Amino acid sequence: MRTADRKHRVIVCSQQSDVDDEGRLLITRAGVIQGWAAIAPVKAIRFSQDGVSMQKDTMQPTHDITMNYNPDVNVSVSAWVYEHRLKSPPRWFKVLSVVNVDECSRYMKIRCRLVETSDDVTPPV
Amino acid sequence: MRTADRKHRVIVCSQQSDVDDEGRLLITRAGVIQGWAAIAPVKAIRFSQDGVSMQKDTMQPTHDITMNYNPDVNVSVSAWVYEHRLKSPPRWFKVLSVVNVDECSRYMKIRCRLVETSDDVTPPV
Amino acid sequence: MRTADRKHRVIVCSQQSDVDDEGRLLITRAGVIQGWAAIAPVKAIRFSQDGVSMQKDTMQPTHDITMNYNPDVNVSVSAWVYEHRLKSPPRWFKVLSVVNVDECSRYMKIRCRLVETSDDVTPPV
Amino acid sequence: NLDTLLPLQTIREHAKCDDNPRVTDDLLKLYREAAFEAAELYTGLSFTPEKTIVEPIRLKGRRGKIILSATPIAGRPVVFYGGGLGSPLELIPRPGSNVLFFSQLMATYVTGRRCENSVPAGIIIGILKLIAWNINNPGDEVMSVRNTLNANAQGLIGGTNNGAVISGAQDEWFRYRRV
Amino acid sequence: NLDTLLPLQTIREHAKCDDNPRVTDDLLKLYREAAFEAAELYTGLSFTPEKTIVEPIRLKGRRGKIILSATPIAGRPVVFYGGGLGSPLELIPRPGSNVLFFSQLMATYVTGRRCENSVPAGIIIGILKLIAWNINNPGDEVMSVRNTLNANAQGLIGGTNNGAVISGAQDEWFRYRRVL
Amino acid sequence: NLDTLLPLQTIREHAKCDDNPRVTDDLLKLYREAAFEAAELYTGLSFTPEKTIVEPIRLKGRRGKIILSATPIAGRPVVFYGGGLGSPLELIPRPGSNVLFFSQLMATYVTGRRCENSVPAGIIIGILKLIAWNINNPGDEVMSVRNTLNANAQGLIGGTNNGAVISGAQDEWFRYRRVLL
Amino acid sequence: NLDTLLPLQTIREHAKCDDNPRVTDDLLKLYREAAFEAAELYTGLSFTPEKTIVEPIRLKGRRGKIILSATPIAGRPVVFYGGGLGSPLELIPRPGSNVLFFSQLMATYVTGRRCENSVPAGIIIGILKLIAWNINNPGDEVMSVRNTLNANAQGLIGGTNNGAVISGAQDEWFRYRRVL
Amino acid sequence: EETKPGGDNGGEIIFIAGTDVKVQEMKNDLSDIHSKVPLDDQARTIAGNFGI
Amino acid sequence: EETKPGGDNGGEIIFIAGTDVKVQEMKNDLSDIHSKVPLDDQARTIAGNFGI
């Protein structure tokens, strides 16, 4: 695709998980890759004041994110995508699958789902 | 959408609810946005004289409303759209989901449902 | 659509219903609007000597009737369409929904169903 | 006078517009009036009542050719006075045309038409068509053939949403014109 | 005042904007003002009762020819003074033509259309179209319509992207403009 | 000063952007003020009320001819002075035209439209069309009729529709310009 | 200094790069620092308000025409000194023009407009446009408009693929450009 | 029109800014209306028959 | 215009930077207005009839 279309700045993050000693569990999202990517919607969104999406299935992707393919990385089941904007509240996406576009190994198309978009998410570390 | 397509005057409203002391509840619908928007149908309508549309699923959108994007407003799960015409009764639309058209953040596409269109609806305050 | 295509003369009627004192009920059809409209089939028809259709679902429309939009009329759940021809037996349609074509408020498209077509229906009053 | 020529019922039944209040009687009267002032202006059959005129004549040639702005009424003396004359002269014009053959010179003829009837079916057909155009073809969305649209990269096709030419009348009246 | 000649209801009824407004009302007033000041100076027919003119003329056309700016009224005599004339001359013009035949030489008269019910129907119809065109053409779409064939050497898109040309307007209110 | 004869509210109502926070007031002011002179220079008409002028004059042609630069006024004498005159001489122009007849020859007069109720709707419609084109059509992609994006396999057609005066703006103002002769 | 003339937020709000930041601010100000070297290198005009200039003139055009390299304001007389001349002369220019009449002969006057001088907003809409076109045309996408009509000559894809002309800039800076 | 000999701007060019007008010059030869060739022949005939 | 004999820049070339103007040179033949051929014949005829 047009390299002037990759007009979204994202940070691909991996999830590190452990239980707090108090008994509950905690998830950390560490940023691994930073680049430009192009997102596009493939489904409507239910916002539910506070921002968090109201999708019921939680397995149907809602956005498609394409970026530079990278042969040394393995986008696992446990990768997130933190997208930051100028004057719009940041977003968290959860990856649901990847597809190597036409197997030409030039672009990865990440099928992901919008988790939440509100001004008070925890940015990566 | 060419800027002459937006040929409808709408009021986007957010509803507040409070319990009636006698035992009922009451929904106050107050306007938050008023601008020009372009609506298009995606389904027929069963009317039941006195206006109230007899749709059964109550989650399948019937009309799609496009208007100008606005990054600070967050169209909730509880937003309404009061469209008033000149020689036709007003209509109450209930939003069901929003689409950020192509993620260009220039237009919103609100999948909404036609609730009622009769000359005796409560306009928003 | 082409104004030379509206080549069918119809009378939109409303249904008035009451029970006969004998215990059974009676339905009258009073003609309210008379104009030219354009019909087109969207499903085959089962005739069953006597004329009456044999559709099982009784909710899938079979014909589409388009005519001049009229902002003051509300085509309810209880509207019929009586179509009279020259040398073909008259027909009765039952409306099942309406759609305001592209919401430009210039044409109403009535999704309707053919009830019966035989030489001995009761014309409107 | 027009209300006896075209009754609004014939229009509303031709243009198949009688059920939609968007086309009221005042606007349709405007349409039916703008279709008769262009029927007697491209064909010149003077559907205007009387309009007596007093203009100055400037005798043109040595054959003595008098030209007139508007045609006279075919049978009423066009009187000439002034310009040196001391006893006004009366001429009788030729029916249909506006040519005559003889301190400035003046002339005072009469124009228009008086009687109600004598409007041929040919004209009305053209007028019905012209109105049927205007009621559902305003000046937006320059169309193309079979009432379609286009994206012709070079330009567009032009002169398509002008009335009276794209539809009928201009050609349904020519049968009443000449050399 | 135009609301006598053409009320906004007839606009909203012709342009099919009765039901859906598509524009507020003051914008419609401005569009109507533009559309009545376009046909007016396009066909050369004024609308206000008069405007008495005083104009300095120059004799040309050795036969003796006077060209006026406006076009008299009709039967009213035009008067010439100054120039060297002992007394004001008085001529009578030809209806609808600013051509007359005879220390500066002026002329005064009045321009016409002192009634209101004289804009016959045409200028009203065309103006309806031109309004209708402006109601949906805020200047966003391109909508350029072709004129003569040969595509310009510069290789542009063409010419004549002109409201009240590419709409009905001209062909509508031209049955009045004279050809000479 | 463009605040009273083109209210920003009218612009925001014309181009239907009254809910866009991405067109701030300063940006709309820059558009409104860059289009009140990019299409005033083009028509050569000042917009202030009647505004006196003084300028030199050079006669042309053996029969005398004075080409001015304003189309001065209707019915008010333009006067000439200096340049071998012994007394200021007063000429009367003819409406619309800016040509006259009989130590540099000077001339003074007053151009403009009488009232402050300034430029007619014709001028304003052009600006409204030009602004609307400017706010929702930046110059970044070549367009085509309607607003399609073609291919052509050969050179694009987009000689002008990139950002030029494609809207009927430029041509509306012209109805007021004046073909010479 | 530039960002005082053209704030970065105005660039971004014009070119839609907001809530969707394409190339970062650094590249944005580089684009700006190059878009003032096409504009005002294509116009000839400079960056200073209401200057007064001094320059040697020549008298080609034996009759005696003078061509200035600016536009003297209306009313202020320009002065000619130096060369064969008893004392500085007083010529009042022709409004909105730079043609005059009658040991190096020099001339001085006051250019610009008397009032405040930004950068004539209007030769900025091209700069905004030239920036905009450069944000979504990094240089891998083949876009090319045609100038000539006929062809290249060989199977060449026409050509004007320049920018600042394909963007609507050249024809929005041209209003401040002399045509000689 | 006002370029005729002894006109206001007589002999100067015509500048038309926009809206190209198109002039075509008619010939109007009119230089053989009497058909000089099949006329002098008739003259030679009706002069020769008189023996001149 | 200012290239007439006795002008500022008379006789020098015209430079136009874009927006190509299109000049076309009119003939204005005017060299047969009186129709010399069907005129001298009439002169001869009304001469020959007087016997000269």
Author numbering:
A (entry chain I), B (entry chain AM), C (entry chain AP): 1 to 125
D (entry chain T3): 2 to 103, 124 to 200
E (entry chain S3), G (entry chain U3): 2 to 103, 124 to 201
F (entry chain R3): 2 to 103, 124 to 202
H (entry chain AK), I (entry chain AL): 264 to 315
Paper text:
Caudovirales, the taxonomic order for the tailed double-stranded DNA bacteriophages, is characterized by the presence of a tail—a host cell attachment organelle that is connected to the genome-containing spherical or elongated capsid via a neck. We describe cryo-EM structures of the neck, the neck-capsid and neck-tail junctions, and capsid of the Agrobacterium phage Milano. The tail to capsid junction involves a symmetry mismatch that is bridged by the neck, and is therefore crucial for the assembly of tailed phage. The extensive network of disulfide bonds within and between neck, collar, capsid and tail provides an exceptional structural stability to Milano.
The 15-fold, 12-fold and 3-fold symmetrized maps of the neck were used to build atomic models of the collar, portal, and neck devoid of capsid (portal + neck 1 + neck 2 + tail terminator + collar), respectively. Namely, the dodecameric portal ring (12 × gp7), which is embedded into the capsid shell, connects sequentially to the dodecameric neck 1 ring (12 × gp14), hexameric neck 2 ring (6 × gp15) and hexameric tail terminator ring (6 × gp18). Besides these conserved common elements, the Milano neck complex possesses a unique, external, sheath-like structure surrounding the neck and consisting of four pentadecameric rings of gp13 (15 × gp13) that we name the collar. In the dodecameric neck 1 assembly, the α-helical and β-sandwich domains of gp14 form the core and peripheral ring, respectively. The core ring connects the neck 2 ring to the portal. The lumen protrusion loops form a diaphragm-like structure that constricts the channel spanning all proteins of the neck and the portal protein. These loops decrease the diameter of the neck lumen from ~30 Å to ~18 Å. There are two alternating conformations of the lumen protrusion loop, with six tilted up and six tilted down. The lumen of portal, neck 1, and neck 2 possesses a positive electrostatic potential resulting in a positive charge of the neck lumen —suitable to hold and position the end of the negatively charged linear dsDNA until the genome release.
